[PDB]
């Protein structure tokens, strides 16, 4: 519950800022921006292609994306690279949904991403020290 | 799809035989019996206690059990010990549901177990050679 709310907060705020323009949580958002933005840049062409293959017709259509994320981890491997890649693809998708409909919300998207992440990887996240661990892994000097 | 149907078959048949009395698939069932029965025996007291904590009021009530299984793997670790333990606990639960209602079916239970297993661990199962890998891991001489 604690980890859910904290994750929802961070992911939601990132997707909101991405769809528009706006402790660890501050650090986590600052890290999510740097890494997530880079992911989206390096892989823009690929991301657009994937967006073409999937559907997502509106704000509420997330079931498609959920299956994609669940399939990402189905090989039994977990790491921060994968978690942040999926969030960044979520941000990319949030941008797309806002373009087609300027008064759609990211809130359902962010909850679906959070849901998968937290429900499927709760103990791993806890062992990795949650968002503090996220910040430390991507830390640069 | 192939792995889903094959897994559904094996898990369903095991739970059916457990709730009542009746290639790799034959070997897998033969292995599932030996290991699954032993799990249930060694841990009968513990299994009964867990059954007390959960609810499962009938055949269709599986959402509770699904969350338990998903939480088992949330630490990011996968192995056959866990997969077969969950199936055995599923068999134990199938026995319980049949006792309270002699004309209830295991079919929804087996599908929920299969669903979690296959959807969340598809690539891992494939890399472990599916049910052939299951048979080999528990092989005794």
């Amino acid at each position: 519950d604690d980890l859910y709310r904290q994750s929802l907060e961070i992911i939601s705020r990132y997707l909101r800022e991405q769809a528009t323009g706006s402790a660890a949580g501050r650090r986590a958002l600052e890290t999510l921006r740097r890494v997530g933005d880079g992911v989206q840049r390096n892989h823009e062409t690929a991301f657009q292609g994937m967006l073409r293959k999937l559907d997502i017709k509106n704000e509420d259509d997330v079931k498609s994306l959920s299956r994609v994320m669940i399939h990402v981890f189905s090989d039994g491997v977990t790491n921060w690279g994968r978690i942040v890649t999926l969030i960044s693809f979520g941000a990319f998708v949030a941008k797309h949904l806002k373009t087609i409909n300027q008064e759609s919300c990211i809130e359902p998207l962010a909850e679906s991403i959070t849901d998968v992440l937290v429900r499927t990887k709760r103990d791993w996240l806890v062992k990795q020290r949650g968002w503090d661990g996220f910040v430390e892994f991507f830390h640069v000097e | 799809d192939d792995l889903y149907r094959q897994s559904l078959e094996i898990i369903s048949r095991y739970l059916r035989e457990q709730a009542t009395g009746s290639a790799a698939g034959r070997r897998a069932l033969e292995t599932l019996r030996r290991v699954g029965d032993g799990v249930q025996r060694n841990h009968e007291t513990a299994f009964q206690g867990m059954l007390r904590k959960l609810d499962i009021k009938n055949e269709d009530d599986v959402k509770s059990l699904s969350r338990v299984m998903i939480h088992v793997f949330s630490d990011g670790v996968t192995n056959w010990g866990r997969i077969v333990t969950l199936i055995s606990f599923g068999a134990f639960v199938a026995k319980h549901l049949k006792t309270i209602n002699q004309e209830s079916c295991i079919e929804p239970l087996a599908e929920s177990i299969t669903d979690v297993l296959v959807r969340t661990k598809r690539d891992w199962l494939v890399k472990q050679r599916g049910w052939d890998g299951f048979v080999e891991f528990f092989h005794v001489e």
Binding site: H43, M50, K53, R67, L86 | -
Partner: peptide, 19 residues
């Protein structure tokens, strides 16, 4: 769907090994 999943998993694992 599953199989854009596997090819997010090229880009993530090979981000994971950048860090």
């Amino acid at each position: 769907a599953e199989e854009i999943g596997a090819x997010l998993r090229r880009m993530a694992d090979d981000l994971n090994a950048q860090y």
